[PDB]
Amino acid sequence: SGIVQQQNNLLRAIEAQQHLLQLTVWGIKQLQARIL
Amino acid sequence: GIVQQQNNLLRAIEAQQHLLQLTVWGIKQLQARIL
Amino acid sequence: SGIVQQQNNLLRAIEAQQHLLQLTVWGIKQLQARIL
Amino acid sequence: ELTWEEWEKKIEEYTKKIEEILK
Amino acid sequence: ELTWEEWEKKIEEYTKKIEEILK
Amino acid sequence: ELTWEEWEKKIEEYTKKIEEILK
């Protein structure tokens, strides 16, 4: 719709991707500890 | 303009989502190998 | 303040998330080389 | 602390949220 | 199945694409 | 080339920067 709504949608998507990025950090650290 | 910049942001987020699909894929590959 | 400022903040956030994502790629490659 | 099963479920949940926005 | 070689190529492609958008 | 210790530090540095931006 408008720019204001679309800005909010982009913000929510980036916030959710930050959670995904944190989850990938956790998985890498888990495997690193197992391997090394 | 703001309209163009908003579209570029969407395209970056879509590409960042593809990257996340790839890193999740790689973590799952190693996890299944290890555990 | 306004949409212009908020849009700039989102750009900086994704720029920083890309650095974070590149670091996760490095960690995955390190572990991949160790395992395989 | 997470089990790998919980990790996978949260990945799916955040993906669903994002794809709803991208759609 | 995806190979690690193509995985690495696709990572580079999307990362380069974002870098060009942000410029 | 990074050590894993340096990797962990930069992860946290970028995480804090993002979280501050997202408020």
Numbering used by the authors:
A (entry chain D), C (entry chain E): 35 to 70
B (entry chain F): 36 to 70
D (entry chain I), E (entry chain H), F (entry chain G): 114 to 136
The authors write:
Entry of HIV-1 into target cells involves the binding of the trimeric viral envelope glycoprotein (Env), which comprises the surface subunit gp120 and the transmembrane subunit gp41, to the cell receptor CD4 and chemokine coreceptor CCR5 or CXCR4, which triggers a barrage of conformational changes in Env complexes that activate the activity of gp41. Then, three C-terminal heptad repeats (CHR) fold antiparalelly onto the trimeric coiled coil of the N-terminal heptad repeats (NHR) to adopt a thermostable six-helix bundle (6-HB) structure, which drives the viral and cellular membranes merger eventually leading to the occurrence of fusion. Peptides derived from the CHR or NHR regions of gp41 have potent anti-HIV activity by competitive binding to the counterpart (NHR or CHR) thus preventing the formation of viral 6-HB structure. Thus, we determined the crystal structures of HP23L and LP-11 bound to a target-mimic NHR peptide with the wild-type sequence or resistant mutations.
To dissect the molecular mechanism of action of the potent inhibitor HP23L, we assembled and crystallized the complex of HP23L and N36, an NHR-derived target mimic peptide. As anticipated, HP23L and N36 formed a typical 6-HB structure similar to many other gp41 core structures. In highlight, three N36 helices formed an interior, trimeric coiled coil with three conserved, hydrophobic grooves, and three HP23L inhibitor helices packed into each of the grooves in an antiparallel manner. The crystal structure showed that the ion pairing did not form as the original design, but revealed three salt-bridges between the oppositely charged residues that stabilized the α-helical conformation of the inhibitors. First, three hydrophobic residues from the PBD of HP23L (Trp-117, Trp-120, and Ile-124) inserted into the deep pocket of N36 trimer and made extensive hydrophobic contacts with the pocket-forming residues. Importantly, Leu-115 and Thr-116 at the upstream of the PBD adopted a hook-like (designated as L-T hook) structure similar to the M-T hook structure observed in other crystal structures, such as MT-C34, MT-SFT and MT-SC22EK. The side chain of upstream Leu-115 was settled at the top of the left side of the hydrophobic pocket on the N36 trimer, so that the hydrophobic side chain of Leu-115 accommodated the hydrophobic groove between N36 and HP23L helices, thus covering the hydrophobic pocket below. Also importantly, the Oε1 atom of the side chain of Glu-119 accepted a strong hydrogen bond from the backbone NH group of Thr-116 (distance = 2.9 Å, angle = 167.99°), which further stabilized the conformation of L-T hook structure and strengthened hydrophobic binding of the upstream Leu-115 with the hydrophobic pocket on the NHR trimer.
